[PDB]
Design a protein around this motif. Structure first.
Motif, PDB file in Angstrom:
ATOM      1  N   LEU A   1      28.013  14.476  23.906  1.00 13.64           N
ATOM      2  CA  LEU A   1      27.161  15.189  24.824  1.00 13.64           C
ATOM      3  C   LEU A   1      25.819  14.511  25.016  1.00 13.64           C
ATOM      4  N   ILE A   2      25.261  13.969  23.950  1.00 14.35           N
ATOM      5  CA  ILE A   2      23.970  13.393  24.026  1.00 14.35           C
ATOM      6  C   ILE A   2      24.154  12.026  23.428  1.00 14.35           C
ATOM      7  N   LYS A   3      23.380  11.058  23.887  1.00 14.83           N
ATOM      8  CA  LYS A   3      23.482   9.723  23.307  1.00 14.83           C
ATOM      9  C   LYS A   3      23.226   9.780  21.801  1.00 14.83           C
ATOM     10  N   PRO A   4      24.096   9.160  20.996  1.00 16.28           N
ATOM     11  CA  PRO A   4      23.942   9.248  19.529  1.00 16.28           C
ATOM     12  C   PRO A   4      22.617   8.694  19.052  1.00 16.28           C
ATOM     13  N   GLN A   5      22.097   7.684  19.735  1.00 17.85           N
ATOM     14  CA  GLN A   5      20.835   7.144  19.338  1.00 17.85           C
ATOM     15  C   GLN A   5      19.670   8.134  19.484  1.00 17.85           C
ATOM     16  N   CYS A   6      19.830   9.151  20.331  1.00 24.03           N
ATOM     17  CA  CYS A   6      18.804  10.136  20.513  1.00 24.03           C
ATOM     18  C   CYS A   6      19.053  11.260  19.529  1.00 24.03           C
ATOM     19  N   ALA A   7      20.276  11.707  19.449  1.00 28.24           N
ATOM     20  CA  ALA A   7      20.609  12.829  18.602  1.00 28.24           C
ATOM     21  C   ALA A   7      20.405  12.524  17.134  1.00 28.24           C
TER      22      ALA A   7
ATOM     23  N   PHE B   1      33.511  16.314  39.604  1.00 31.51           N
ATOM     24  CA  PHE B   1      33.515  15.651  38.294  1.00 31.51           C
ATOM     25  C   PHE B   1      33.222  14.147  38.270  1.00 31.51           C
ATOM     26  N   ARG B   2      32.933  13.505  39.405  1.00 26.12           N
ATOM     27  CA  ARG B   2      32.664  12.037  39.406  1.00 26.12           C
ATOM     28  C   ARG B   2      33.891  11.231  38.936  1.00 26.12           C
ATOM     29  N   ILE B   3      34.965  11.954  38.636  1.00 21.61           N
ATOM     30  CA  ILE B   3      36.261  11.394  38.324  1.00 21.61           C
ATOM     31  C   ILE B   3      36.863  10.787  39.590  1.00 21.61           C
TER      32      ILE B   3
ATOM     33  N   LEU C   1      17.770  18.547  22.662  1.00 17.73           N
ATOM     34  CA  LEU C   1      17.776  19.454  23.793  1.00 17.73           C
ATOM     35  C   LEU C   1      17.921  18.589  25.074  1.00 17.73           C
ATOM     36  N   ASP C   2      18.907  18.913  25.889  1.00 17.23           N
ATOM     37  CA  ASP C   2      19.179  18.181  27.130  1.00 17.23           C
ATOM     38  C   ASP C   2      18.972  19.122  28.301  1.00 17.23           C
ATOM     39  N   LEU C   3      17.903  18.912  29.045  1.00 15.37           N
ATOM     40  CA  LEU C   3      17.592  19.649  30.244  1.00 15.37           C
ATOM     41  C   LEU C   3      17.605  18.735  31.492  1.00 15.37           C
ATOM     42  N   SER C   4      18.410  17.711  31.453  1.00 12.30           N
ATOM     43  CA  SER C   4      18.559  16.814  32.589  1.00 12.30           C
ATOM     44  C   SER C   4      19.158  17.556  33.765  1.00 12.30           C
ATOM     45  N   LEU C   5      18.841  17.079  34.966  1.00 13.37           N
ATOM     46  CA  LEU C   5      19.402  17.638  36.205  1.00 13.37           C
ATOM     47  C   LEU C   5      19.236  19.161  36.314  1.00 13.37           C
ATOM     48  N   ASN C   6      18.037  19.614  36.023  1.00 18.30           N
ATOM     49  CA  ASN C   6      17.670  21.005  36.230  1.00 18.30           C
ATOM     50  C   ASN C   6      16.714  21.039  37.425  1.00 18.30           C
TER      51      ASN C   6
ATOM     52  N   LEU D   1      22.009  21.576  28.011  1.00 20.56           N
ATOM     53  CA  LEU D   1      21.680  22.459  29.131  1.00 20.56           C
ATOM     54  C   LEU D   1      21.569  21.692  30.471  1.00 20.56           C
ATOM     55  N   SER D   2      22.241  20.559  30.564  1.00 18.94           N
ATOM     56  CA  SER D   2      22.340  19.791  31.799  1.00 18.94           C
ATOM     57  C   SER D   2      22.999  20.550  32.952  1.00 18.94           C
ATOM     58  N   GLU D   3      22.529  20.311  34.159  1.00 20.87           N
ATOM     59  CA  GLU D   3      23.048  20.974  35.361  1.00 20.87           C
ATOM     60  C   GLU D   3      22.977  22.483  35.309  1.00 20.87           C
TER      61      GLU D   3
ATOM     62  N   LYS E   1      10.850  12.314  19.023  1.00 20.12           N
ATOM     63  CA  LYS E   1      10.911  10.879  18.723  1.00 20.12           C
ATOM     64  C   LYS E   1      11.622  10.066  19.774  1.00 20.12           C
ATOM     65  N   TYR E   2      12.522  10.697  20.529  1.00 16.17           N
ATOM     66  CA  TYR E   2      13.285  10.046  21.595  1.00 16.17           C
ATOM     67  C   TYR E   2      13.155  10.913  22.845  1.00 16.17           C
ATOM     68  N   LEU E   3      12.519  10.359  23.861  1.00 17.54           N
ATOM     69  CA  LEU E   3      12.233  11.080  25.069  1.00 17.54           C
ATOM     70  C   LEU E   3      12.826  10.320  26.277  1.00 17.54           C
ATOM     71  N   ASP E   4      13.747  10.962  26.971  1.00 21.75           N
ATOM     72  CA  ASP E   4      14.365  10.369  28.168  1.00 21.75           C
ATOM     73  C   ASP E   4      13.769  11.037  29.397  1.00 21.75           C
ATOM     74  N   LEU E   5      13.027  10.254  30.154  1.00 19.11           N
ATOM     75  CA  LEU E   5      12.349  10.750  31.339  1.00 19.11           C
ATOM     76  C   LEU E   5      12.880  10.093  32.604  1.00 19.11           C
TER      77      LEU E   5
HETATM   78  C1  LIG Z   1      20.174  12.235  29.703  1.00 16.30           C
HETATM   79  O1  LIG Z   1      20.870  12.806  30.775  1.00 16.30           O
HETATM   80  C2  LIG Z   1      21.286  11.770  31.698  1.00 16.30           C
HETATM   81  C3  LIG Z   1      21.968  12.489  32.848  1.00 16.30           C
HETATM   82  O2  LIG Z   1      23.025  13.225  32.304  1.00 16.30           O
HETATM   83  C4  LIG Z   1      22.318  10.830  30.997  1.00 16.30           C
HETATM   84  O3  LIG Z   1      22.769   9.847  31.907  1.00 16.30           O
HETATM   85  C5  LIG Z   1      24.098   9.393  31.704  1.00 16.30           C
HETATM   86  O4  LIG Z   1      24.082   8.234  30.908  1.00 16.30           O
HETATM   87  C6  LIG Z   1      25.401   7.727  30.635  1.00 16.30           C
HETATM   88  C7  LIG Z   1      25.348   6.690  29.506  1.00 16.30           C
HETATM   89  O5  LIG Z   1      24.053   6.149  29.362  1.00 16.30           O
HETATM   90  C8  LIG Z   1      26.050   7.210  31.938  1.00 16.30           C
HETATM   91  O6  LIG Z   1      27.385   6.753  31.781  1.00 16.30           O
HETATM   92  C9  LIG Z   1      26.024   8.323  32.992  1.00 16.30           C
HETATM   93  O7  LIG Z   1      26.255   7.782  34.270  1.00 16.30           O
HETATM   94  C10 LIG Z   1      24.658   9.008  33.068  1.00 16.30           C
HETATM   95  N1  LIG Z   1      24.827  10.135  33.950  1.00 16.30           N
HETATM   96  C11 LIG Z   1      24.047  10.376  34.985  1.00 16.30           C
HETATM   97  C12 LIG Z   1      24.426  11.611  35.770  1.00 16.30           C
HETATM   98  O8  LIG Z   1      23.070   9.676  35.272  1.00 16.30           O
HETATM   99  C13 LIG Z   1      21.611  10.180  29.807  1.00 16.30           C
HETATM  100  O9  LIG Z   1      22.374   9.395  28.956  1.00 16.30           O
HETATM  101  C14 LIG Z   1      21.100  11.283  28.940  1.00 16.30           C
HETATM  102  N2  LIG Z   1      20.279  10.650  27.965  1.00 16.30           N
HETATM  103  C15 LIG Z   1      20.521  10.736  26.653  1.00 16.30           C
HETATM  104  C16 LIG Z   1      19.522  10.111  25.736  1.00 16.30           C
HETATM  105  O10 LIG Z   1      21.486  11.300  26.190  1.00 16.30           O
END
Ligand SMILES: *[C@@H]1O[C@H](CO)[C@@H](O[C@@H]2O[C@H](CO)[C@@H](O)[C@H](O)[C@H]2NC(C)=O)[C@H](O)[C@H]1NC(C)=O
Ligand SMILES: *[C@@H]1O[C@H](CO)[C@@H](O[C@@H]2O[C@H](CO)[C@@H](O[C@@H]3O[C@H](CO[C@H]4O[C@H](CO)[C@@H](O)[C@H](O)[C@@H]4O)[C@@H](O)[C@H](O[C@H]4O[C@H](CO)[C@@H](O)[C@H](O)[C@@H]4O)[C@@H]3O)[C@H](O)[C@H]2NC(C)=O)[C@H](O)[C@H]1NC(C)=O
Ligand SMILES: *[C@@H]1O[C@H](CO)[C@@H](O[C@@H]2O[C@H](CO)[C@@H](O[C@@H]3O[C@H](CO)[C@@H](O)[C@H](O[C@H]4O[C@H](CO)[C@@H](O)[C@H](O)[C@@H]4O)[C@@H]3O)[C@H](O)[C@H]2NC(C)=O)[C@H](O)[C@H]1NC(C)=O
Ligand SMILES: *[C@@H]1O[C@H](CO)[C@@H](O[C@@H]2O[C@H](CO)[C@@H](O[C@@H]3O[C@H](CO[C@H]4O[C@H](CO)[C@@H](O)[C@H](O)[C@@H]4O)[C@@H](O)[C@H](O)[C@@H]3O)[C@H](O)[C@H]2NC(C)=O)[C@H](O)[C@H]1NC(C)=O
Ligand SMILES: *[C@@H]1O[C@H](CO)[C@@H](O[C@@H]2O[C@H](CO)[C@@H](O[C@@H]3O[C@H](CO[C@H]4O[C@H](CO)[C@@H](O)[C@H](O)[C@@H]4O)[C@@H](O)[C@H](O)[C@@H]3O)[C@H](O)[C@H]2NC(C)=O)[C@H](O)[C@H]1NC(C)=O
Ligand SMILES: *[C@@H]1O[C@H](CO)[C@@H](O[C@@H]2O[C@H](CO)[C@@H](O)[C@H](O)[C@H]2NC(C)=O)[C@H](O)[C@H]1NC(C)=O
Ligand SMILES: Cc1cccc(-c2ccnc3c(C(N)=O)cnn23)c1
Ligand SMILES: Cc1cccc(-c2ccnc3c(C(N)=O)cnn23)c1
Ligand SMILES: *[C@@H]1O[C@H](CO)[C@@H](O)[C@H](O)[C@H]1NC(C)=O
Ligand SMILES: *[C@@H]1O[C@H](CO)[C@@H](O)[C@H](O)[C@H]1NC(C)=O
Ligand SMILES: *[C@@H]1O[C@H](CO)[C@@H](O)[C@H](O)[C@H]1NC(C)=O
Ligand SMILES: *[C@@H]1O[C@H](CO)[C@@H](O)[C@H](O)[C@H]1NC(C)=O
Ligand SMILES: *[C@@H]1O[C@H](CO)[C@@H](O)[C@H](O)[C@H]1NC(C)=O
Ligand SMILES: *[C@@H]1O[C@H](CO)[C@@H](O)[C@H](O)[C@H]1NC(C)=O
Lengths: 739, 750
Positions: free
Chosen positions: A406-412, B500-502, A418-423, A382-384, A465-469
């Motif tokens: 979509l999500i870092k494998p180490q977190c997933a 897209f940062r592309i 759930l990804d609510l980044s950049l909201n 749910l990013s952006e 267990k994995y929290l990205d803040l």
């Molecule tokens: C949480 O969301 C942020 C923002 O989307 C992710 O940040 C990206 O991280 C990757 C790899 O670490 C980078 O290549 C991108 O530049 C980042 N994008 C931005 C917009 O900062 C972050 O990885 C996500 N965290 C997890 C655990 O998946």
């Protein structure tokens, strides 16, 4: 000692890495029993019959990107090589397919050249070709208006499985394609109409790519030409009738408004369909074609938004409930304001739907409880969007779709993500997480979030267990911060700052916390508690703070700042502006350390004797500092050190027997120092020396010798191990020297 | 030629700038005419009665920040000798006491940022001519001091004292026996939790009182912060201010106020500026009796009174705001609410002089924009850090009221200004600007805005003159983009990229040519590397193009020479910035096709290996050529043959190791030559050449590895024979060889 290539034995074969080396010709040094040769990214201009002379054992040659009016290839230059299977000739400015290629070839890549003619002379003998890549040859060029494909040129290739002609102007699908074809790539080929005849009897096709014909050019980054009146690609109703094995179909950016359900009648094994960058808002609402895809696993309907609109609601056909095999639904960039329970009813019964991707919809409000009515959701992306605080290029890259998880494998890996980044979650509302399923991995990155963490904000999803803040403005001064997440293993607080003092007492409370990232928090002083403590913590990243200030404290308050991390194995102190680490502050780093990074500081001196207090240290990284001296007795101070990185320092003297014991040392990096020579000096397997100003008089002959006497040791970038003096040698490799 | 100080005239006296110069003592080499001496930010450790012998006429000494990286040691009566000393600055000197026996000639004394815990008679009584006394920041939190001890009546003797600042010390209560001369009393962050009726007499002249930060609101506080017991506010007796009839400025920021006693203002009819930031006044903003008591207030700050955990639908503004008849600026940042309706601001609509409404950082989702039409005098509507959507450290700075302009002055000078930066406007909706008044200055920075500009988006505010679109994702490929803004003079598109940062993004800059009065265009860091279908920028009006951070290296190495004229069509261009374009070599004919109108050409921070000086012939108005931070190796022998207009030539951070003979010689248009941070070991006469003579007046040489000596003696002597030519930073014109000499200034030789 292979020069200029690095030769490596791998499986049964032997490889020669010879790329990016400023070579102006095919070395004759190379040989023999090499089976693969990578000569890519050099300055090579000519290939002749002697370029590969008596190298029959060559199986694969890569000549890509040569040279940096282009590569000149004599007819039958490769005709010699009886076992040549794979020949890569990309980005070589070739004006035609080279003549007389050996019929042993199973793979040929001619991407990114200036080949406007595909002839029987060129490829008709190559009856063993499996894979042929001709993409990116006539793409936005006045010179070639149209790629000319001689009639039946491919009919003779009866073992051909993959054919790629993407990014050439073709206007229509070439006729007389062999029925051995499995993958046909025809992206951005200006083919505006697909007849019943075009893919007839390709009963082995598993993949068809027609993306980017009649493109949707709105807001297109690259140059882009729509069909007249931005009309859609025109595909006859029977165009796909014999493609019974199609698994992958890509119709991204074909300006589709409607999808003929009959296209899928004979295609009951379709797995992945992408329909990104079309005009399918209406079709997503009705969607007859959805009944025709009971084995589809991946559907991508991203970026079908209508210009100028921001509709309240998303309208999802009930026919989505017929996608019984759906694993992953991508709906980025539809663009709408709210998501109600009912809107996703059709998806709630799909037994394997594990990924819902709603990135970049700018959704203001979501009825979160709807995500409880799913049986197998593992990834909610749910990013952006615009959720608020709740109080009540590369030719071998995908040009449209993903390439990264979509999500870092180490977190997933921990479970439901759930990804609510950049909201727009500028603080955590008391109801923020109320209606969620049990989340294990949560991303709240970059929400300008200024929450004063107090021990209650995460209690409704206490199994995270994995929290990205990261990239927020959080206050974690209260020792209660985040302690409600009693199972927390990974916590990323990188780039946190205020809209500043710190209190890190919260860390101790966690029984299972493994990885903590405090990078670029600008930490320069702690309040009341001066000591980090944890029995569980394995990894602390502390880069980009101010240990220089902390460790020049007049009262020595922080001489133990890390000693209480009793389980610590990896510590990163990079980018802390360190000039000098007081001796006892060094001795108070955890004795459990295995990996210590102190790179990119300003260290003028390093007390080697203190490694004696770190009997587990395997990796010591001191790159990018200002160090002058190396101890003469390293082996007295460690038997565990395996990797030592000293590049970008000011070392000008290599003490004798530094290559002798310590014998634990496997990898020694002294690149980019100030060494003029190596004089007095096994188990070592890598030694990096490039970027030192070597003095190439007869003093160097000792070192040269030692290189011949120790072929077990690996010296990369030999071509970059360069004489700086005297002037007549300046610029040459030290290996090229004589007497 | 002064050393080590930079001496100079200023008004009708002479000044010595001697700061930041690694001095370990007060120089004895100081010019005799000097009346003000700035020795701040050095390595000075001791001041004695001999330190300033020979400078009787010193009027002002600044010794701040000595020494850098134990403190400054000052003998008793060290300054007593200086009969004319008015102003003495002694900040950040790690002093443990007020130095003894200061001259009674002092009118200004600053002792901020030291370790002075005792304010004694003896120390300061006797300085009966003090007007301004600064003792702030002596016991900040850590840790000692224990409470600042102020000897009873120490200030009663100073009968001319107008300003007294004791902010950032632990005092617990207002010192008694303050002179009636006081006009400004600063008592911020002094732990004074209670203000009695007796505390502020007989201060009948007070114009300013600062009690900010006593009983602070510590929620989310960046600095260390100790509240009073519970959430308790500062406690101010009802009659505390009854005799402060002259008060103009009152600062009660961060005093944990919930209620404002209207009786505090009964006898205070001139109050002009009132700061109530960082309190809990949401309820008071809704009722606000005290508002009827302030008919002369001009600036009201009620910012950051938000309630933790809350995000209310609506802001509740008392009707009593309509009684603030003199109000010019209302600051309401950080109240935090979701919607703004017409009615909510009805009280403000009748205030005749209200020109600034600051609603920054409220996270407002929706605003009824038509409400801003009902204000006769609004010039600044600041709406940054809200959530509008598409419509379909330093002690002399203010610690709580953020003090640079809300909007850049060069934008606000064009007229009415609206700032919607950092909102949620990810495209421009067709109703975005409906019902706005006439906006002249508009800021849409940093909204992730991906609009395909097509000529209609701005038609409801067609008179915008200054448009900041920085940090968005805009597509301006349509030649109609922004053409509805026919009066546009300044356009900032810095840091624009594709959604897209592309990479690989193409551009079409045809839209520029349409504007007949566009003066300034900023295309910085747009990563421009190729243009589609038209390869020329054209404009008859444009004076300034900023093109830094793009890829002219790629554009100008084009095999077909398509961009050999990219800028030639900017027929009136005077200033061009080509910095940060990765340029190694500018083709000769591309350089000749830069507009001949140029006055200022910046090509700094590229990688230039060579420069064709002969081509300056084609630029008969060029006054300034900036080539700093490149890799250039040589200088032409006779610049004078190629230009007669050049005044300023900046060559610092290059690889120049030889100055040509007959260079700097002849004309003589050249006023300023910067050759700092190159590789010069020496300068031989010629370049010392005469007689023209050279109209040179500044020559920068610092950071060259000079070989002292004595090949240098020629150059040294030329410096003595040309005192007109200024050479700054002499302390940094340093011998590199042969140390023993290394590290000395070149002037120190014999
Ligand atoms: C949480 O969301 C942020 C923002 O989307 C992710 O940040 C990206 O991280 C990757 C790899 O670490 C980078 O290549 C991108 O530049 C980042 N994008 C931005 C917009 O900062 C972050 O990885 C996500 N965290 C997890 C655990 O998946
Ligand atoms: C996109 O590009 C534009 C155009 O270049 C940038 O906007 C310009 O920004 C520069 C500064 O970076 C502005 O220049 C500055 O003007 C200041 C204001 O001028 C006042 O005083 C002068 C005196 O001549 C009056 O003319 C004027 O009316 C104002 O009262 C000056 O203070 C600055 O002084 C500079 O020179 C002195 C030497 O005298 C130095 O001491 C200073 O430190 C400083 O170098 C300076 O000239 C310019 O005004 C802006 N123009 C416009 C139209 O806004 C944007 O910033 C850029 N966008 C981004 C994101 O970078
Ligand atoms: C509480 O509010 C009051 C107002 O009611 C506010 O008082 C202001 O304090 C500031 C900061 O000290 C004063 O501004 C200074 O004024 C003097 C004299 O004209 C100048 O010398 C200062 O400028 C110098 O320093 C600046 C930055 O350090 C530089 O910008 C400049 O180049 C100079 O070197 C500075 O402008 C201001 O005068 C008073 N207002 C008055 C007296 O009316 C007070 O600070 C608030 N309290 C807190 C803790 O925030
Ligand atoms: C239209 O959609 C098509 C359907 O997805 C897209 O086809 C994909 O195109 C990409 C890029 O051109 C191919 O990616 C390459 O894959 C090969 C082969 O990988 C094999 O080995 C790897 C080892 O990692 C393994 O993971 C795989 O399972 C493979 O067996 C690599 O050599 C390349 O480096 C690169 O990854 C995709 O494979 C291809 N999908 C296929 C063939 O199924 C198509 O690109 C879309 N069109 C556009 C224009 O974007
Ligand atoms: C804050 O610090 C965190 C911890 O340092 C950062 O997360 C770590 O980032 C590194 C990359 O920077 C990750 O390491 C990479 O992992 C991949 C994947 O490895 C795969 O194979 C290995 C074999 O050992 C296996 O163990 C894995 O499970 C994977 O299957 C490697 O390919 C890379 O070479 C590299 O090792 C860490 O995994 C990652 N740790 C965690 C816990 O996520 C984080 O990035 C930092 N935050 C910011 C904003 O900088
Ligand atoms: C438009 O708003 C943006 C963002 O608020 C302003 O950007 C700030 O500009 C100043 C002065 O140049 C910087 O010192 C700040 O650090 C900037 N902040 C960010 C986040 O970029 C911009 O100045 C405003 N434009 C105008 C014309 O006033
Ligand atoms: C996915 C996405 C991201 C950013 C913006 C949009 C969008 C939605 C509706 N209209 C637009 C426009 C427009 N109307 O020009 C430009 N972008 N955009 C869509
Ligand atoms: C001005 C501003 C900026 C950012 C956040 C807030 C805010 C509003 C409501 N609650 C909060 C909190 C909180 N609840 O801890 C932290 N910030 N904040 C307020
Ligand atoms: C290739 O090389 C030959 C001789 O080395 C040269 O004559 C010719 O110019 C090149 N071939 C082509 C087609 O240009
Ligand atoms: C310490 O780390 C090790 C190895 O990762 C792990 O097995 C162990 O459980 C940890 N100890 C504690 C107390 O968490
Ligand atoms: C108070 O104010 C006036 C100037 O406005 C002045 O004449 C008078 O002397 C002042 N009171 C003093 C210095 O006690
Ligand atoms: C408004 O401003 C003008 C000039 O600044 C001033 O003369 C007039 O008194 C002001 N009106 C009020 C009510 O203060
Ligand atoms: C060119 O610019 C100058 C300002 O530098 C101005 O005085 C002049 O009128 C302008 N000329 C044109 C034609 O716009
Ligand atoms: C400078 O450019 C001119 C073009 O007018 C050319 O004739 C001359 O050779 C160039 N000088 C150098 C040093 O390249």
């Amino acid at each position: 000692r292979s020069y200029p290539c690095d030769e490596k034995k791998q499986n049964d074969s032997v490889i020669a890495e010879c790329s990016n080396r400023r070579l102006q010709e095919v070395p004759q040094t190379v040989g023999k029993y090499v089976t693969e040769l990578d000569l890519s990214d050099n300055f090579i201009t000519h290939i002749t019959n002697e370029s590969f002379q008596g190298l029959q054992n060559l199986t694969k040659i890569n000549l890509n990107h040569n040279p940096n009016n282009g590569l000149n290839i004599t007819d039958g230059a490769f005709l010699n090589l009886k076992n040549l299977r794979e020949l890569l000739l990309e980005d070589n400015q070739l004006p035609q397919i080279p003549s007389g290629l050996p019929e042993s070839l199973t793979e040929l890549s001619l991407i990114q050249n200036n080949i406007y003619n595909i002839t029987k002379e060129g490829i008709s003998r190559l009856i063993n070709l499996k894979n042929l890549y001709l993409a990116w040859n006539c793409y936005f060029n006045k010179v070639c208006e149209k790629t000319n494909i001689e009639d039946g040129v491919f009919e003779t290739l009866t073992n051909l499985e993959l054919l790629s002609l993407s990014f050439n102007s073709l206007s229509h699908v070439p006729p007389k394609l062999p029925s051995s074809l499995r993958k046909l790539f025809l992206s951005n080929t200006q083919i505006k109409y697909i007849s019943e005849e075009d893919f007839k009897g390709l009963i082995n096709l598993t993949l068809l790519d027609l993306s980017g014909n009649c493109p949707r050019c709105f807001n297109a980054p690259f140059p882009c030409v729509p069909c007249d009146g931005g009309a859609s690609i025109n595909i006859d109703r029977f165009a796909f009738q014999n493609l019974t094995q199609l698994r992958y179909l890509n119709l991204s950016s074909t300006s589709l408004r409607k999808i003929n359900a009959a296209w899928f009648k004979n295609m009951p094994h379709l797995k992945v369909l992408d329909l990104e960058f079309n005009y399918l808002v209406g079709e997503i609402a009705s969607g007859a074609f959805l009944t025709m895809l009971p084995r589809l696993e991946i559907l991508d309907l991203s970026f079908n938004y209508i210009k100028g609109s921001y509709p309240q609601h998303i309208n999802i056909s009930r026919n989505f409930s017929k996608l019984l095999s759906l694993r992953a639904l991508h709906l980025r960039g539809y663009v709408f304001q709210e998501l109600r329970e009912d809107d996703f009813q059709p998806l709630m019964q799909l037994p394997n739907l594990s990924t819902i991707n709603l990135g970049i919809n700018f959704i203001k409000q979501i009825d979160f409880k709807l995500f409880q009515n799913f049986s197998n959701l593992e990834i909610i992306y749910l990013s952006e969007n615009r959720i608020s605080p709740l109080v009540k290029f590369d030719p071998h890259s995908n040009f449209y779709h993903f390439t990264r998880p979509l999500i870092k494998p180490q977190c997933a890996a921990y479970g439901k993500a759930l990804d609510l980044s950049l909201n727009s979650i500028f603080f955590i509302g008391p109801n923020q997480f109320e209606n969620l399923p049990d989340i294990a991995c949560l991303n709240l990155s970059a929400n300008s979030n200024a929450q004063v963490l107090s021990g209650t904000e995460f209690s409704a999803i206490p199994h995270v267990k994995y929290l990205d803040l990261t990239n927020n403005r959080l206050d974690f001064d209260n020792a209660s911060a985040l302690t409600e997440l009693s199972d927390l293993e990974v916590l990323d607080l990188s780039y946190n700052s205020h809209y500043v003092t710190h209190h890190l007492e919260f860390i101790q409370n966690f029984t299972n916390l493994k990885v903590l990232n405090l990078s670029h928090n600008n930490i320069y002083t702690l309040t009341d508690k001066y000591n980090l403590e944890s029995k569980s913590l394995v990894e602390l990243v502390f880069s980009g703070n101010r240990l220089d200030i902390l460790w020049n404290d007049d009262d020595n308050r922080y001489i133990s700042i890390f000693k209480g991390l009793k389980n610590l194995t990896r510590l990163d102190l990079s980018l802390n502006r360190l000039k000098h680490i007081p001796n006892e502050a060094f001795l108070n780093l955890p004795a459990s350390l295995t990996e210590l990074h102190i790179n990119d500081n300003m260290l003028k001196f390093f007390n080697w004797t203190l490694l004696q207090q770190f009997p587990r240290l395997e990796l010591l990284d001191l790159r990018g500092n200002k160090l002058l001296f190396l101890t003469d007795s390293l082996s007295d101070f460690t038997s565990s050190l395996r990797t030592l990185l000293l590049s970008h320092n000011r070392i000008s003297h290599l003490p004798s027997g530094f290559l002798s014991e310590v014998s634990s040392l496997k990898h020694l990096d002294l690149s980019s120092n100030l060494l003029k020579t190596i004089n007095k000096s096994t188990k070592l397997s890598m030694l990096e020396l490039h970027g030192n100003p070597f003095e190439c008089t007869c003093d160097i002959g000792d070192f040269r010798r030692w290189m011949d006497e120790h072929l077990n040791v690996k010296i990369p970038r030999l071509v970059d191990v360069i004489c700086a003096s005297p002037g007549d040698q300046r610029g040459k490799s030290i290996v090229s020297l004589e007497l």
